[PDB]
Design a protein around this nucleic acid. Sequence first.
RNA 1: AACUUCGGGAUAAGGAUUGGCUCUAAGGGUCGAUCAACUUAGAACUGGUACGGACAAGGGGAAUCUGACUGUCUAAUU
RNA 2: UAUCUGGUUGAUCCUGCCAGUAGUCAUAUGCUUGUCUCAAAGAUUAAGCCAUGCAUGUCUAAGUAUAAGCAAUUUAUACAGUGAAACUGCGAAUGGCUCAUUAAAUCAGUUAUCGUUUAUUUGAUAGUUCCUUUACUACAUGGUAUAACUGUGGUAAUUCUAGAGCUAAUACAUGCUUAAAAUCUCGACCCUUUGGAAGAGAUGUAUUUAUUAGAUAAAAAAUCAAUGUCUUCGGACUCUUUGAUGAUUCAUAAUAACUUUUCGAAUCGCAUGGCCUUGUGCUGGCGAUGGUUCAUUCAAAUUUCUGCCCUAUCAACUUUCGAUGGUAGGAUAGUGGCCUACCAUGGUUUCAACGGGUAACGGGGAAUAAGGGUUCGAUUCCGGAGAGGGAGCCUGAGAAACGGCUACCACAUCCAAGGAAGGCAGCAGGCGCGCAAAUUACCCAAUCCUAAUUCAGGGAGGUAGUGACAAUAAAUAACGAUACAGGGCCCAUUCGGGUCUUGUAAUUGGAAUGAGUACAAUGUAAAUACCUUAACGAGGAACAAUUGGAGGGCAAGUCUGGUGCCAGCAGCCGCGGUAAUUCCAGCUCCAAUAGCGUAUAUUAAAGUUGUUGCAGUUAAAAAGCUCGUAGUUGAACUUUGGGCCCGGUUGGCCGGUCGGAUUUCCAACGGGGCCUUUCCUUCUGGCUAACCUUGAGUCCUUGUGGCUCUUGGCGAACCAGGACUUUUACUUUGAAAAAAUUAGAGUGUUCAAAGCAGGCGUAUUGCUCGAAUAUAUUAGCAUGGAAUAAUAGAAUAGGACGUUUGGUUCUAUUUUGUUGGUUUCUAG
RNA 3: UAACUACUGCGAAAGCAUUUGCCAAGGACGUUUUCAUUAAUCAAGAACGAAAGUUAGGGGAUCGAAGAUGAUCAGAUACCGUCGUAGUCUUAACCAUAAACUAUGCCGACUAGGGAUCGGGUGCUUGCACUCGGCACCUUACGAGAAAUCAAAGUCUUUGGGUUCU
RNA 4: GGAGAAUUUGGACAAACUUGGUCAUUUAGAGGAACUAAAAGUCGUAACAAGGUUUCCGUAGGUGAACCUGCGGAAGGAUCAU
Lengths: 260, 185
Amino acid sequence: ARGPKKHLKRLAAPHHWLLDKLSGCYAPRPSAGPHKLRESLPLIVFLRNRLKYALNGREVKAILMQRHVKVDGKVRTDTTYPAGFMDVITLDATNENFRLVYDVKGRFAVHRITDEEASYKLGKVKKVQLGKKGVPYVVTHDGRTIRYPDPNIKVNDTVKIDLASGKITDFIKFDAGKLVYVTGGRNLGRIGTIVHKERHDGGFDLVHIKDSLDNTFVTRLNNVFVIGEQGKPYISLPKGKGIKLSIAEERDRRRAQQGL
Amino acid sequence: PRAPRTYSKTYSTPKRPYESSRLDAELKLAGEFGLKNKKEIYRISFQLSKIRRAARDLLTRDEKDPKRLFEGNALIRRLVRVGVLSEDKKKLDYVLALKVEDFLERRLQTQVYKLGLAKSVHHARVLITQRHIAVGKQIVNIPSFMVRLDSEKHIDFAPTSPFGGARPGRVARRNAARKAEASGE
RNA sequence: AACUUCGGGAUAAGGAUUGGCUCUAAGGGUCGAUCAACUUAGAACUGGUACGGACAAGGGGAAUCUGACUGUCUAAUU
RNA sequence: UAUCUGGUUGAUCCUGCCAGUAGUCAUAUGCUUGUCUCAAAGAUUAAGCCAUGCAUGUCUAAGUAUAAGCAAUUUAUACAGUGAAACUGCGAAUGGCUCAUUAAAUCAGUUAUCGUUUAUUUGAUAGUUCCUUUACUACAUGGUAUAACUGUGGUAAUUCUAGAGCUAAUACAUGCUUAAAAUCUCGACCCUUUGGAAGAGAUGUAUUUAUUAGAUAAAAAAUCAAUGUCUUCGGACUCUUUGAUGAUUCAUAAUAACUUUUCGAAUCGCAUGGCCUUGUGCUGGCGAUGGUUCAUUCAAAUUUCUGCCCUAUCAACUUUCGAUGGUAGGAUAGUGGCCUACCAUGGUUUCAACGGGUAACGGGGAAUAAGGGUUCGAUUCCGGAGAGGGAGCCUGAGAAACGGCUACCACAUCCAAGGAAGGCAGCAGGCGCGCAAAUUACCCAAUCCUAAUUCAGGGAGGUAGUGACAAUAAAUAACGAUACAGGGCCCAUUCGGGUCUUGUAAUUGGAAUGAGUACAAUGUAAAUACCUUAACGAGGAACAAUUGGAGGGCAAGUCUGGUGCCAGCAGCCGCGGUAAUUCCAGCUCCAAUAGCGUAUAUUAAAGUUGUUGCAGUUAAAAAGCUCGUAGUUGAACUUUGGGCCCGGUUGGCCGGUCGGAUUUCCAACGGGGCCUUUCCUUCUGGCUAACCUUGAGUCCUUGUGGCUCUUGGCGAACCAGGACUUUUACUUUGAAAAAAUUAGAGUGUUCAAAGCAGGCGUAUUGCUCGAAUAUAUUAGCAUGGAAUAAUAGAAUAGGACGUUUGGUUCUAUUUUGUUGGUUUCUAG
RNA sequence: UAACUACUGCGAAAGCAUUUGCCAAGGACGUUUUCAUUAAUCAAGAACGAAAGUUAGGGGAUCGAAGAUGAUCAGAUACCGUCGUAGUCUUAACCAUAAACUAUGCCGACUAGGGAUCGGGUGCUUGCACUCGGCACCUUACGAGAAAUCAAAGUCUUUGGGUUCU
RNA sequence: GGAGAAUUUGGACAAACUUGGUCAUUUAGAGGAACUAAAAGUCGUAACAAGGUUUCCGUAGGUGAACCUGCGGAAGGAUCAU
Ligand SMILES: [K+]
Ligand SMILES: [K+]
Ligand SMILES: [Mg+2]
Ligand SMILES: [Mg+2]
Ligand SMILES: [Mg+2]
Ligand SMILES: [Mg+2]
Ligand SMILES: [Mg+2]
Ligand SMILES: [Mg+2]
Ligand SMILES: [Mg+2]
Ligand SMILES: [Mg+2]
Ligand SMILES: [Mg+2]
Ligand SMILES: [Mg+2]
Ligand SMILES: [Mg+2]
Ligand SMILES: [Mg+2]
Ligand SMILES: [Mg+2]
Ligand SMILES: [Mg+2]
Ligand SMILES: [Mg+2]
Ligand SMILES: [Mg+2]
Ligand SMILES: [Mg+2]
Ligand SMILES: [Mg+2]
Ligand SMILES: [Mg+2]
């Protein structure tokens, strides 16, 4: 329609932001940025809707223009900045550091982390190819170009990133036995060990994933994200740890809390 | 360009409108429970129908099925909570065999009458709309209100209004004034 | 186009093109050589946009009366 | 949430329709209307026409201030604060509206770009610019040319502008800048040496072409183009560098040149520090804007597969002048008949092409709903198209833009008649059209969007007004005691004891109340209204419920008066001609009720469209008869049975505390692997994990409830490799199929429709559960099964397997130094 | 083309009846012959199709639309009566319809007794039985049907063998 | 000493207007000929009984009107019968 769209209607928003239907008509349209639109969480959502610090979209700007909040160690003044998976939101006041990571329902958790952990983030490597003057580089899932990587690093490997420097500290090869975070689909937010990979040339590779309670499931390779070795998560995981209980089993765990 | 606000019809009119056997049996219920309209009866027939439809659709499915186990127990507990379904019957089969009067017996209007308080269903409707009776803390002025079995003890006259306490009304405060000024000079 | 005896109506109606020059292509005969006609189609260029340049050479359509048609007669008013 | 009833007859059983009945986020209309919440609303006809107003502009510490503007109180002879104007930048391509066009088009799901462009965001990324590098060329910083502004003017008239004079830049146009090194060509000089070397030039990036690298299937050396090792010297003769993809001429890097030669910061704020050579020396922080390329994100464009309503009173269509394909070019961001030239004769179609119609924008969805269906979808989300009709186009990353321009056409405005200015299918409003639809209101407070941007702007949007579209809840009375008819049982004397209480009286009592009006709070941008609440506000004549009926279908009167086949009623059957159960009325009664009726459409009823599931002797309907192509359909037959073994899942059996537990066993039901004349793709290195490999045997519940590891192992436990693999249908599981809507869990919105909230504390500086889940095929994708149904195979054997045994045909790996020439042994 | 002539035959139906030749055709039966799914039903498209009717030659006895004509009758250009054109027959072309009817599509399977009869075959004790294939018929109704009725009009709410048409 | 206005050649794109052609959709019309309401009027009496000539089908001719007649069918006939 003549050129790019600047609005987003509240119903056409991502469901996983959990915006109320009545209060509004539009919803905050993510600016262009590191993450894809439907996979992001605008800061205005994070501040106002999720943490309950701001009450309006004016107050979100009041907070952003003080230059408190910083995403991956750099200050941002954009209400609709597209923060996404593995990003570190650091507030100076409070001294709360959070990492955006999916709970099991497939929604961004309020996952508070220690100040040590906030030094780094993981990065799924998307493409690895040779740049100008023969200099090799990798491309992470948040679109960071990193030049001069370890030649062991191939596509689909995760890569630990220093943030301050923005350099590869360490990496994890994609193989059988590695822990995984599923970052899309029905099984968004589940955690589990890789079992084997199905090939399918000129198609979509699939990844069988066991979990701690011995429930297998398959996803597309595009939705998988390596996060460690077996029982050795590089980041801190949220409460649950990507388990997926039945609606029955969930309802039983409410009746423990119901006692009070 | 807002979101649509949803809404729903809460009742269903009967198919054939001058069936004499029905019309008699309806007025039996409007008398016993003191209901304004046939619409109040139709409301409860419609709520029963959705329940029975829900239970039939589960009994088609096998025992030891997730959706049956989950929603079956949820339907049962939801009825047991409001005291429509008794504590003995919790099979699912028993929720099907469940009459219209088994809902009527748990609404405020009748539950006021049955706990003393009024002396008639026709009085209870008045008391409720006149804002006298109150559930635990707050006033309820809706006779339709289904009492939830953990609230039946807590029904009493309000902290506001006469009977319970407070000022002695509007008519008394005029009728006290007229006798007082007549006696005095 | 109507209509039709299915033969017609019909050049229906209605449009476009046409010179000069310089080329190209195709179409044959006789023993790979050799000999030879005009026909047709195309392209470039060119001009006071002319050009079937004089001559030569249908106006057409919608209906009606009437005789079917070609044919014949009042040489000198039909 | 599986239902029927009235109407053909004298009566009957049928066929069969008509009529009834219920629903409709389904329109109109009639009568009627107290309250709370919620709220559609000029789509239908006319994508008809539009007066007026408004709907897009934008500024920070940080492009440009000599406003002859406001300040100033004293940060400044450059400026310095706050700032109209104008230049510059960005935006105005979003939003909102509408549904005219449009039927393989749009659109939906699903692919693709190894087929392309992409402002912006985010992440990377730039010592190589003078060319005589000893003439000049400022880099302590380069050139005019213009606005606003000041004057002088024109014009009837407009967001019209001329002439003259000033002056800025992150505008415009130029233009220096700063480390080594390596490698190549050129080559002075001497020396014919297996000769080598001054010093000369070039080497960023982008642009255009040509060329080159971008290896790889394992082990041997011959023979050297030899003329290069490394001097052990018989010339030991090694080690070399190679990323990604299923796949490339990919990325990337060279080589030779090319270019109306791209970019490589003459820019701006706030901090002011460190070295001393105290000159305005050298060096230096935080970050604004800018910029080449790559990546990213927001997109865009094209694109694969399958899917669309009625029509044969449309059967052939397309191909002159692109139809289908080929080659080359042109054009495009790029692919492609997209276009041009040349050549071929193709392409679609009874499995419905082509044509016509649509009161057709597609989809998510809606209504009705036993199951299956039928009908609707202008309309809140997504996609498309349009801005009176057509075409063209500038600007820009993005437009074939219309609150941009240009033209033609149609319509219409102002004029001093010379000319000028137009586009509500944005908001409101008007006219017209019609059965058919609201205020020329208030506001950026919420939602979010734009900008140079915490501030400005936004008829996007929100708030109220109008509003019986639809939906939720729900007043219009309640309770006494004599009263007055009795009925319940007990005094049963025939008096009736008013016995237990139920009705009816224009009989009398004290209570209760929000509808309304209204302090004041609350609410809100400001209100209004809810919610809360002082004060005030029911006696029945008033605060007074209606709309339709009373023969049947169908619930309710052969009650009174009127009319007399008239007036009128009557969906249908029928009533009415002087006792009208039917008309006009009164009374009484019925039904639904703040609603009820009517009209039209539609769904169910309709097994009266029939797949489920109708009918065809005679009710409507078997072709006059046979042949016949498509279509539909089509006999049986190919590993079956038996013996084993191992984990599973429920009930067990002692659920023993009426609720949950495990041993072996009783089973049932399912699942896998073996063996039985038993494809269980095949081989080629990763790795042999493991457990009949045993260097210390008895670590150890009934020898079937079993180990501390060494030594080739035994690779179906587990990855990429060539090697070739009959082909479908069907079905399982997975994945997918936006949100909203539907079903559905949780949650006392006072209940409810709703909503997505909420709930517990020491309520004094806080803890906590949530915002599930299911369905949605037809198509495509992955996966298990191999019944059913189709399909292929060895019959003139051109058949199968093969360590054979020759010919023949190419392929190239570690070597044989290394390129290269080059015969073999190999190895496929 | 009588009588013979029938609840008999043949043919896809329409239809087909004196004798004998000639020409091809066909069902059924018999078969320890042959091929091996070649089939069933069929939009489109085709062949054949009573009578009447049409065009042009032949023929033209009889009957006979029209018409003439005598009765009847209120009328009677109707029935009845006497004549009579086309027609009735044939050759070459057309036409494409009928109560073209069993008012019953075709193919396949199954469900129940009976005797007659036509064609072929087999056994015989030579006129009877069995058999396949035909035209039908009688009884019952298991079933079916609104009923009349129906051995198919059955095996349909216990609803599905295949397929065309309406 | 390079920008650069009017103007102008050829080109593609191409509105719009004449003009025929074609398809679709509405609509006027003297007069004509039907149909229905429709059952009542006029004239007959064709059908229903052997409906007074059994009825009906196809066809062909006749004609105030129903109808009548020929040829060939059918029974749905007034005969299941020698
Ligand atoms: K003549
Ligand atoms: K009744
Ligand atoms: Mg738009
Ligand atoms: Mg003519
Ligand atoms: Mg002509
Ligand atoms: Mg003449
Ligand atoms: Mg003369
Ligand atoms: Mg090409
Ligand atoms: Mg339309
Ligand atoms: Mg729509
Ligand atoms: Mg429309
Ligand atoms: Mg308009
Ligand atoms: Mg547009
Ligand atoms: Mg335009
Ligand atoms: Mg406009
Ligand atoms: Mg616009
Ligand atoms: Mg029927
Ligand atoms: Mg046919
Ligand atoms: Mg016929
Ligand atoms: Mg008669
Ligand atoms: Mg008769």
